[PDB]
Design a protein around this nucleic acid. Sequence first.
DNA 1: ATCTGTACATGTACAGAT
DNA 2: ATCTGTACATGTACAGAT
DNA 3: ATCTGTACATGTACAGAT
DNA 4: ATCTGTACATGTACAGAT
Lengths: 348, 356
Amino acid sequence: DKLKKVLDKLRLKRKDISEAAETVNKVVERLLRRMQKRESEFKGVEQLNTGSYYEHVKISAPNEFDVMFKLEVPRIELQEYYETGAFYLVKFPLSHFVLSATKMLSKFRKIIKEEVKEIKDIDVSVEKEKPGSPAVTLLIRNPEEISVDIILALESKGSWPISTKEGLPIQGWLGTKVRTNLRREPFYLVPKNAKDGNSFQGETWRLSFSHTEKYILNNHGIEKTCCESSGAKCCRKECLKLMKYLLEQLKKEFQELDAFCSYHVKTAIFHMWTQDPQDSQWDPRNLSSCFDKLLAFFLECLRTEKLDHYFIPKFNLFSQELIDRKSKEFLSKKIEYERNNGFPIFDK
Amino acid sequence: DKLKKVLDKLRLKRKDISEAAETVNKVVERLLRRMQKRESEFKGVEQLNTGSYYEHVKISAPNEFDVMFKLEVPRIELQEYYETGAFYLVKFKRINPLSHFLEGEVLSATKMLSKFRKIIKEEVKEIKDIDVSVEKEKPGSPAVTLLIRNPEEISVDIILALESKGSWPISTKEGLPIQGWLGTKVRTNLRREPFYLVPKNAKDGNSFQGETWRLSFSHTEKYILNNHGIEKTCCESSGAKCCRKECLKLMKYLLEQLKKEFQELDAFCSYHVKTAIFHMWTQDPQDSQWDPRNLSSCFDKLLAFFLECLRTEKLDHYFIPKFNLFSQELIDRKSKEFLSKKIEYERNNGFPIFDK
DNA sequence: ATCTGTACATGTACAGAT
DNA sequence: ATCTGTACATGTACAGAT
DNA sequence: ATCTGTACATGTACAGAT
DNA sequence: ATCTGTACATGTACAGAT
Ligand SMILES: Nc1ncnc2c1ncn2[C@@H]1O[C@H](COP(=O)(O)OP(=O)(O)OP(=O)(O)O)C[C@H]1O
Ligand SMILES: Nc1ncnc2c1ncn2[C@@H]1O[C@H](COP(=O)(O)OP(=O)(O)OP(=O)(O)O)C[C@H]1O
Ligand SMILES: [Mg+2]
Ligand SMILES: [Mg+2]
Ligand SMILES: [Zn+2]
Ligand SMILES: [Zn+2]
């Protein structure tokens, strides 16, 4: 009962979706035209919608959209960045950009910013640049506030880099045919825009499988009929929404949680889904015991500082080098507290 | 156990398969290239391997291969022939490599098939490697059949197909009812792939005889056979085995064995058993209703179903539900009760015909 | 110089053979 | 159990054509 | 090459049936 | 409370026309 009521509060309304998307769409098509039908260095970018709104796991409001402008770049060679798994140098139209992420992102940002100054019918400005975002973020003021991430991404049709060979362990869940087919799809590089003052940081790209994650969200069952009109609904996404909400509520209260994000929850539940592949283990009637085991799994990830990237298994999202242990135990205690006390944080 | 041992006799041999496939591929590759050359009306034709060998349900010996030479034919058409569901006249809107086969807008299937056959025949004379001749045309068949004596005997049906990328003809709207078994996402995708038209090629002396085409879904059937489960891992290296293909195999063998002894069964063929089992797989969707341990009862329920189809004279085409392959107009009830008894005998007597 | 239809290159599920 | 040969999807190099 | 058109899956919303 | 059925909405893939 309780979790249900939370999910109805989390539900987006058809009317807010209609108005939010029609304005987002207007802006994104225009920015896409400016890239192509003007003789630019990104002539030929294609649009690919990603993220939780397009996975149907967006909660609360339709106020955050994610769009990837992807560009095919042929026979480009990669080189792994100090055995990290996820970050790569790109070596060999793109002349005026080793292919530089910061240089290529900067012009991309310029073009979008020029085009946004010429918007006159929608209240839209470009958010200030951020450290660690490959994105140009647009703040749109409908009556309401909507943010849009325009992600720049290179697209390579070659086979996936060696670090992902162990990745994507869907063989017991979605299957070897699905895996092999997914691995025939392209793979994508986005800017690692870190400002860490470290090393190759300006020339570093990050792998991106947002297109694979989108498929999996939309094809998440062991039975092909999971959540279709002639099958049984499951509660896999409803658990992801509840765990995203718990993290969102926590992050609002405790800035000591600034270094956590929804992709940690996303990653953790890809692992749970592979641990519990049967659709019956995610029966709607077990929603409470399913949330519960997901919190437990997330608490074992915090406690052991181990959250491997579902596609790059040697890339630990919970390594000391990314998040301090105090932050993890901070989060453990809040999680433990909410869990044993029937989630008071949900009731506000 | 009894049924396991049959399956072991039915299994093909990798040694036979290598020798068959090498020869067959050499020929098919050479006829496809010849299609490509010159001002051939069939330049652009494209190969597509179909049938039980490429579905991994070919039994006994690898002695029969089916290959589509398929040709994309843009520009719309299609006039359903007398509400039969399955048969169509092809019309053209522009006035073209297929200029020669037209009869004012209408594409002559037999004229197309005649030229196809002459070209295949001309290119067969010039093969000097392997013993391969072109079998005499059989009525009601879109195929050009190669008999190969790679020492042993091997058939290869070259089927001429037109390929249309449009949405499927409306007589399939209610067909392919996989929603509860393979699901709607699958159905929509499958219905987005092209559909194919092959020459009917009957010499019945009915109107439009030489201009009638028949629908073909062999590409959809191949997907279905290699993707037959509710669970995505059915029969994969990290999932549970089933016995769906094993039942079809046992069904096909009973029919083949019977069809050898008794010529009363000429009007029956493996598409009949194949069709009946697509219905069975839709009736029993779950992988657990096809557990390998239950092979006997699965084969049993499939037989009883087939017998009811025979006896009530109803075997609806899986893709064109208004097309009844067992309608009186296709097979005499005499033939249908002859098969009912022969099946009933085998079933009540521990399948003697398997021991042959 | 450039382009491209054809054929090779690469990867893996399936299923038989050990 | 592991090993292996065929089929098939997709990427890519190239001799020959523009 | 760009763009529209078509079909349908995934949603929300709600009324009536269990 | 849950389930089924219809209406209303957006996203998406691709054929065919420009
Ligand atoms: N740290 C990261 N490493 C790799 N990929 C990431 C990372 N953060 C985000 N992504 C990718 O970018 C996608 C969009 O990011 P983001 O908007 O933050 O998340 P989301 O999944 O849309 O969740 P919300 O529901 O909006 O919180 C999701 C994922 O494919
Ligand atoms: N009467 C028919 N109506 C529609 N499609 C047919 C018909 N007969 C055959 N086909 C199609 O052509 C394919 C090849 O037929 P055929 O060679 O007789 O059987 P098969 O499936 O190859 O099995 P076997 O070779 O007999 O083991 C199977 C099916 O997709
Ligand atoms: Mg989002
Ligand atoms: Mg065959
Ligand atoms: Zn589901
Ligand atoms: Zn199976």
